[PDB]
Amino acid sequence: SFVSKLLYTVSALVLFHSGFSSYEFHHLLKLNSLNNAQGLPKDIMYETYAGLILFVLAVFTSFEKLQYLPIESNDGKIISQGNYLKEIALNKATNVDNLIGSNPNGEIIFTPSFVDVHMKRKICREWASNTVK
Amino acid sequence: LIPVWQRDEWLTNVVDYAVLDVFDSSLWNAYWL
């Protein structure tokens, strides 16, 4: 289990508990004042800054360096870009697809309709030959 | 005999008044406590 959703939950809950803490102190800041005829924020503030910094940290680890695998192979051969996001220039965006043996044009190149009907017949015959293989 | 009812008439004329109210009743260590 990685830290991002953990940090979301603990950050929301530590803010929630800072909330209940600030509830008690600041409700009893003006309610107790009524006892004094309308008469420790500091560590509350420090734990608050802890909560804010941790929630900010929490958002980052929901963003990971993008990591990929090759389509044709069946080994892992894990493809890392060392990059967090996906870029805008079509030339190198086309690169990150071409690291895979894929073509987002897809069907126009492959023509599934004509190929398949012969493909299924010959491939069953063909592997039936390869069953010894 | 039976005390049937009770009355109090000390309160028949008040001149002046006053009000009384009623009411209820370093950092690292702070974190844990």
UniProtKB/Swiss-Prot annotation, chain A:
GO biological process, alphabetically ordered: phospholipid metabolic process; phospholipid transport; protein folding in endoplasmic reticulum; protein insertion into ER membrane by stop-transfer membrane-anchor sequence
Keyword Cell membrane found: no
Name of the protein in its database record: ER membrane protein complex subunit 5
Transmembrane segments: 6-26, 44-64
Subcellular compartments: Endoplasmic reticulum membrane
Keywords associated with the record: Endoplasmic reticulum, Membrane, Transmembrane, Transmembrane helix
UniProt KW Transmembrane helix keyword: yes
Other known facts: Present with 5240 molecules/cell in log phase SD medium.
Family: Belongs to the membrane magnesium transporter (TC 1.A.67) family.
Record-level GO cellular component terms: EMC complex; endoplasmic reticulum
Annotated organism of origin: Saccharomyces cerevisiae (strain ATCC 204508 / S288c) (Baker's yeast)
Alphabetized InterPro entries for the sequence: EMC_subunit, MMgT
Topological domain ranges for the Cytoplasmic compartment: 1-5, 65-133
Lumenal side: 27-43
Pfam families, alphabetized: MMgT
Record membrane topology: Multi-pass membrane protein
Role description: Part of the endoplasmic reticulum membrane protein complex (EMC) that enables the energy-independent insertion into endoplasmic reticulum membranes of newly synthesized membrane proteins. Preferentially accommodates proteins with transmembrane domains that are weakly hydrophobic or contain destabilizing features such as charged and aromatic residues. Involved in the cotranslational insertion of multi-pass membrane proteins in which stop-transfer membrane-anchor sequences become ER membrane spanning helices.
Oligomer status and interactors: Component of the ER membrane protein complex (EMC), which is composed of EMC1, EMC2, EMC3, EMC4, EMC5 and EMC6.
Chief location category: endoplasmic reticulum
Curated annotation (Swiss-Prot), chain B:
Coiled coil regions in record: none
Description of post-translational modifications: N-glycosylated.
Subcellular location: Endoplasmic reticulum membrane
Note: Present with 2840 molecules/cell in log phase SD medium.
Family (UniProt): Belongs to the EMC1 family.
Oligomeric form and interacting partners: Component of the ER membrane protein complex (EMC), which is composed of EMC1, EMC2, EMC3, EMC4, EMC5 and EMC6.
Main function: Part of the endoplasmic reticulum membrane protein complex (EMC) that enables the energy-independent insertion into endoplasmic reticulum membranes of newly synthesized membrane proteins. Preferentially accommodates proteins with transmembrane domains that are weakly hydrophobic or contain destabilizing features such as charged and aromatic residues. Involved in the cotranslational insertion of multi-pass membrane proteins in which stop-transfer membrane-anchor sequences become ER membrane spanning helices.
Protein name: ER membrane protein complex subunit 1
Organism per entry: Saccharomyces cerevisiae (strain ATCC 204508 / S288c)
Organismal lineage: Eukaryota, Fungi, Dikarya, Ascomycota, Saccharomycotina
Originating gene: EMC1
Residues of the full protein shown: 206 to 254 of 760
